[PDB]
């Protein structure tokens, strides 16, 4: 059965990205939509909206790419190069304020589920709180 929804969402995004789709669908959830809004704000995705698919709530994600490249392999540069899931079922990862990782010298983002809502690494450091480490994107 489906054991990890957030990992599933990350995998769906990655798979759709690698084939240069304009859209992808993931089952709707509050946590998922929070992650999606966080991703959209940092300009990793074009946008998202809540759609209805065969009487079931779904979230449609719009993917963003770079300009068409010159020469052989003219496929556009990806915006989301790499998206891992840190805290998995069976091994939960928690970090304090002093232990929030810096991803790619600040060129990436680490998304935290803090006590004050789902924040990025920067917002978590600014507010001075820690929590479950969800994912890193660069």
């Amino acid at each position: 059965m489906l054991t990890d929804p957030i990992a599933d969402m990350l995998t769906r995004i990655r798979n759709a990205t690698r084939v240069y789709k304009e859209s992808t669908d993931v089952p709707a959830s509050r946590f998922k939509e929070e992650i999606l809004r966080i991703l959209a704000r940092e300009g990793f995705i074009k946008g998202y909206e809540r759609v209805d698919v065969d009487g079931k709530p779904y979230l449609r994600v719009y993917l963003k790419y770079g300009p068409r490249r010159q020469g052989p392999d003219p496929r556009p540069e990806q915006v989301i190069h790499h998206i891992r899931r840190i805290s998995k079922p069976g091994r939960r990862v928690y970090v304090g304020v002093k232990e929030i990782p810096r991803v790619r010298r600040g060129l990436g983002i680490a998304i935290l589920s803090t006590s004050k809502g789902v924040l990025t690494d920067r917002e978590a450091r600014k507010l001075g709180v820690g929590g479950e480490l969800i994912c890193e994107v660069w």
Binding site: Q70, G71, P72, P74, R75
Partner: protein, 220 residues
Amino acid sequence: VKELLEAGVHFGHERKRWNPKFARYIYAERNGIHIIDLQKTMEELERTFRFIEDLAMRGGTILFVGTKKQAQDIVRMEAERAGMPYVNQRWLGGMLTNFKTISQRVHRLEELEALFASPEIEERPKKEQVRLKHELERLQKYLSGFRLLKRLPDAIFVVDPTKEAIAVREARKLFIPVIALADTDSDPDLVDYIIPGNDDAIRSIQLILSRAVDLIIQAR
């Protein structure tokens, strides 16, 4: 529209052959055939013609590559009715990436045709004459039209981007923009400026090439 529709432009290949990447130009399926959306064809044609006219008025040269059975005559006539070089017999591996080597062959061809029009052939017993004549025949068969390239062209015009995938690949390697009259079974990614239409049915090829050549002539 109203020009392409009667030319059989919007008639593609059977469902056995179509490429998934080309679905963005397919309109619908009729009687087990693919129909190309002629509107999208119109915008793409407009864009490619704008590019062609800009290049022509800049003074650049376009190389025409059509190596099908039927497209030979039309390509030959259209290129001849312009300053544009053409290849229609066969695409030799390395016409572009190995342009230096083939330039040597072009020079050999020109010197040979000059030699046969010279009074020093009274020597060289007739067997050597036969050998040289056969060599000249081969060269003028293959290298005709290609003689008009003094250097690498600025663009390329391929009729079937799959029949001539090698030329497309070579054009990619050297950052030469690719213009193609691609069809259902083609890859749109390898073509910068694409005309979604039929590459069979001589009518369509003639129409597109005639229009393009007229635009080139006008834009001089």
